[PDB]
Every structure is written in C-alpha cells, then in structure tokens.
Amino acid sequence: SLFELGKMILQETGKNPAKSYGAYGCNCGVLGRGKPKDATDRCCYVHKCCYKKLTGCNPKKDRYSYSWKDKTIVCGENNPCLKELCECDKAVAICLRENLGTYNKKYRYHLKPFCKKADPC
Amino acid sequence: SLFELGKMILQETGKNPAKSYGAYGCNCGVLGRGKPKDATDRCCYVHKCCYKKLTGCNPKKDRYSYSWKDKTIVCGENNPCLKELCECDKAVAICLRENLGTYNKKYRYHLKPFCKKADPC
C-alpha cells in the first residue's frame, strides 16, 4: 500500500516521499505517466508499469509485510500479487535512491506536468 | 482540477496552497489518507473521502467552472460529477480557512511515513 511504499522511499532515499516524489516529473506522483524527464522520473515510470502487471490486488490500499533487515528491503512472502507489489515498491525506492545524484527539484510541480506520452507498459 | 482547487484554497485561506497544504499532515496532498493529525488535516481527510464518492470525473485533471462572487466560492451547475467535484474542493477550502487557527507548520511537510492507518471513509 501507500504506507509501505512511502516508508520504503524514505528508508532508501532519506527524502520525505511526498515532498520529493509526490509530484516530480511525468511519473513520480498521482498523474499517471509521461515520458520520463530524468533518471528519477524513469524510476517512477517503471514503478507504475510494474503496478500494471499485478493481478487484482490494489497497489494503493493493499498492505503487505516487508522487512528492513540490515537496511535492505526484504519483501515478505505474503502471497503472489502482494509479493510482486512489494517488489515493485522496493524497486522504485531503490531506484529513486540510486538516482539521488541527478534528482532535480526543478522537476517538482504543484502544477500538473507538461509531458509527452509515455510508451505503453 | 488542481487548478481550481488551488485557486479556491488561496481565495479562502490566503495561503499558497502548494506550500501550506500540498504535503500537510497525513491527509493533505499527494500520497494517501491517514489518521488526521489535527483539524486542518481532518479537512483533507474529508476532502479525500468526498473525492471517493465522485462518479464521472477526475479531480486531479478535470476542469470545472466556479466563480468567486462576493468572496464566496460558487460552483457552477456543471455536470453532476463536476458540480460534486467542485463542491468537494469548495468544502475543503472553507474547512482549511476555518481551521487556520490551528494550522501547524510542523505538519506542513510532515513525513507521511509516520502516519498510521486511517479509518475508512
């Protein structure tokens, strides 16, 4: 769910997930995809497509178990969809962290982004 | 759309919507509902709940017509959903103004990963 996702983002990235990634480029946020503006944005694009693949579980609401042991996210067995969902969230948080180097606040918006079409997932 | 909502928030509250309420508490702005931290946050919880009852339209991208007449938000007729979208945004703008007395900056860019599971709407 958004709870686990936001926690993973904070854990990996050290950033407030909402402030940094809640409205960033074409894909980070709630608006849905666009051609990524940079590496961070690409992370969010992949994450959304990752969400497209799940079977019926609700990525926003469905809670799942994961471990932060030795400061690595380990998705609990849960069940198939939930496990996959967890792996999607883990992958974005890792990705966002890996790309903090080029994170660019100019890509933050109040203001619904200005994006070319995304490729289909 | 976020455009009308931001404009209403600014008209009611006199604050920059994005900075003051874009990330406030557990309920305001991008990324989920949680147990409201306070009155302001509760306005946003109610707003998100209101959004859930919306049928034909998207609050984030769908434009709608309202007017500010004698310093009051007046939702156009619109169609059913957009009248209802408009009224959700009007109600949260009013609520946020009504609760400016307890607005708490410390919640302004609250770390949402600290929020705990909210009641269903």
Taking an 8 Å cut-off on Cβ atoms, the answer to whether B113 and A17 are in contact is yes
Q: Tell me whether residue B47 is one of the annotated catalytic residues.
A: yes
Resolution for this PDB entry, in angstroms: 1.9
Q: Give the closest of A10, A29, A112 to B61, CB-based.
A: A112
Give the fold, CATH level 3, of B1-121. Answer: Phospholipase A2 (1.20.90)
Q: How many CB atoms lie within 10 A of CB B55?
A: 9
Contact B49, B61 (CB under 8 A): no
Nearest to B28 by CA among B11, B49, B4, B56: B49
Q: Nearest CA of chain A to the CA of B101: how many Å?
A: 24
Query: Torsion over CA of B105, B110, B114 and B120, rounded to 10 degrees?
Result: 90
Which of B38, B41, B62, B89 is an active site residue?
B89
Contact A28, A41 (CB under 8 A): yes
Nearest to B17 by CA among B25, B5, B32, B26: B5
Domain boundaries of chain B, sorted by first residue: 1-121
Q: Tell me whether residue B41 is one of the annotated catalytic residues.
A: no
Contact B12, B24 (CB under 8 A): no
- Which three-class secondary structure string do you get for chain A? CHHHHHHHHHHHHCCCHHHHHCEECCCEECCCCCCCCCHHHHHHHHHHHHHHCCCCCCCCCCCCCEEEECCEEEECCCCHHHHHHHHHHHHHHHHHHHCHHHCCHHHECCCCCCCCCCCCC
CA-to-CA dists, residue A46 to A39, A50, A53, B7, B110, angstroms: 11, 6, 11, 32, 27
Whether the CB of A3 is below 8 Å from some CB of chain B: the reply is yes
Element (H, E) at B66: strand B66-69
Whether the CB of B1 is below 8 Å from some CB of chain A: the reply is yes
Whether the CB of B29 is below 8 Å from some CB of chain A: the reply is yes
**Method by which this entry was solved:** X-ray
Long-range contacts of the stretch B87-92 (C-beta < 8 A, 24+): B87/B50, B88/B47, B88/B50, B88/B51, B88/B54, B88/B59, B89/B4, B89/B5, B89/B8, B89/B47, B89/B59, B90/B8, B90/B66, B91/B46, B91/B47, B91/B50, B92/B5, B92/B9, B92/B43, B92/B44, B92/B46, B92/B47, B92/B50
- Cα gap A94→A68, rounded to integer Å: 13
User: Which of B5, B10, B26, B30 is the best mutation test for A, with the most CBs of A within 10 A?
Assistant: B30
Give residues with Cβ within 8 angstroms of B4, minimum separation 6.
B63, B64, B66, B86, B89
Residues of B in contact with A19 (CB under 8 A): 23, 109
